[PDB]
Amino acid sequence: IVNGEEAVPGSWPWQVSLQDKTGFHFCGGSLINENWVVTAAHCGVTTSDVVVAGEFDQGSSSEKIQKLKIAKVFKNSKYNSLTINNDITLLKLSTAASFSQTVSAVCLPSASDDFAAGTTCVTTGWGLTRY
Amino acid sequence: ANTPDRLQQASLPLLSNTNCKKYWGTKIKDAMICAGASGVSSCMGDSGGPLVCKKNGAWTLVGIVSWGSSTCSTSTPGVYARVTALVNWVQQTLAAN
């Protein structure tokens, strides 16, 4: 996030880091319950990648995190790799996340919800702060 | 060049489709929602993370970080997967698995 700010640690407890088997962060995602993460289809997640829950400082070797294996990847079959439309994938965890002060789920909307233009919303992540 | 160690956040406004299309034109499709162009930008490593808005006091997933300016410009709209258009697929997938 360019021109964002540091979050209060643990205050976005559904935010996960998607990492390869060496620990390299390549995408974010959101817990929607103890067994499932929602992320983007173009992230290309496989069952070799891992979901890291409870993280704040990826440079802190001593932070208490949950490194969760992925049992199955559910890419929306309508993801359009040309137009980027329908860019969503679900990850089913092989072991449930353990919810806590720093790990819990985001709510999902109903298909009919209207979120008005101009509403102040929030986005979070460990992406670049300068391109 | 490298990602921040510590989790970042930014507040930003949802944009109407009409205003988003003033920049991106016909690249904006029906399962996309735009936000930002407000001095902040999602960027490489943010993809797949959340865009949340309050609904009756509870943070609710409205977008999934998807794509945008290829230099992460803070004055152009960021584009997010529109969760309202995709949540029936989410619920069906959970129910079957």
Binding site: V8, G10, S11, W12, I32, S104, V106, V122 | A58, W59
Partner: peptide, 11 residues
């Protein structure tokens, strides 16, 4: 869901 145990602080 959607209610953090630690409240976010946003400028």
């Amino acid at each position: 869901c959607g209610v953090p145990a630690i409240q976010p602080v946003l400028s």
